Design a protein around this ligand. Structure first.
Ligand SMILES: C[C@@H]1COCCN1c1cc(C2([S@](C)(=N)=O)CC2)nc(-c2cccc3cnccc23)n1
Length: 249
């Protein structure tokens, strides 16, 4: 089972990171009864034991889903402890070692990832995702004053944001989804795009300048998708054909 093989590789990387100096504070979840404000600051807690248990729960079908959770450890330390704090440097040493190991094993990992999910090897899926990424970076992120929507909100700076917005979305998260080939159709892409606008309506109000900017992001997305309709339609058809042939095997 290539997912078993992949999981063994990821666990070996966790073993190597656990072995780096001074990493113990990242080996297990933060104790929120000692660090009493931790969840008032951090939205997505992560540590190496949770990561390892997730590897064992078969939650990571590729190196990117694993690396994203590992990067939370660093991001969380940067937010809570500070970007230059020794703990953040320590967490970064783990991410750096992971990246070394992923590079060393990149061909084996690619083979496993394609055996787990053949669409990662499908030229139509790849072309479709490439077009979506270009719409995001060249059209949507180019909307003036679109910065509030480029990245997830950091709760340290906006403490009530996730009490109001329980289904958050942002353009970076969409780009990560595109890189993982999450979208096979314009419909699922537009579900996430529209969530950015819906969250602005809810948090900022329908008449706010934030929402006017988010509306322009959505509108330029629709305009650009319409311009590429005939190509995107062909790619979506061919992706459906590939998806059926995978489950057929
Ligand atoms: C809540 C507002 C409005 O709704 C849409 C999101 N939005 C954001 C988003 C972000 C981020 S970030 C830096 N990763 O948190 C880039 C994603 N930052 C800020 C922000 C941060 C700090 C002080 C501010 C002071 N005034 C205004 C905004 C501030 N607001």
């Amino acid at each position: 089972d290539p997912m078993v093989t992949l999981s063994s590789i990821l666990e070996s990387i966790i073993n190597d990171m656990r072995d780096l100096p001074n990493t113990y504070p990242f080996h297990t979840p933060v104790n929120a009864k000692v660090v009493k404000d931790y969840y008032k600051i951090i939205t997505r807690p992560m540590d190496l034991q949770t990561l390892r248990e997730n590897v064992r729960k078969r939650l990571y079908p590729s190196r990117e889903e694993f690396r994203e959770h590992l990067e939370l450890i660093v991001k969380n330390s940067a937010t809570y402890n500070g970007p230059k704090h020794s703990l953040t440097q320590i967490s970064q040493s783990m991410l750096d070692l992971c990246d070394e190991k992923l590079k060393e094993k990149e061909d084996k990992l690619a083979r496993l990832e394609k055996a787990i999910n053949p669409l990662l090897d499908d030229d139509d899926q790849v072309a479709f995702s490439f077009i979506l990424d270009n719409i995001v970076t060249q059209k949507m992120m180019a909307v003036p004053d679109s910065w509030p929507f480029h990245h997830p909100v950091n709760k340290k700076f906006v403490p009530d944001y996730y009490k109001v917005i329980v289904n958050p979305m942002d353009l970076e998260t969409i780009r990560k989804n595109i890189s993982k080939h999450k979208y096979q159709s314009r419909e699922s892409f537009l579900d996430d795009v529209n969530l950015i606008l819906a969250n602005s309506v809810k948090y900022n109000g329908p008449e706010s300048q934030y929402t006017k900017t988010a509306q322009e992001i959505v509108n330029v997305c629709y305009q650009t998708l319409t311009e590429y309709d005939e190509h995107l339609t062909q790619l979506e058809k061919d992706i459906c054909t590939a998806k059926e042939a995978a489950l057929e095997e």
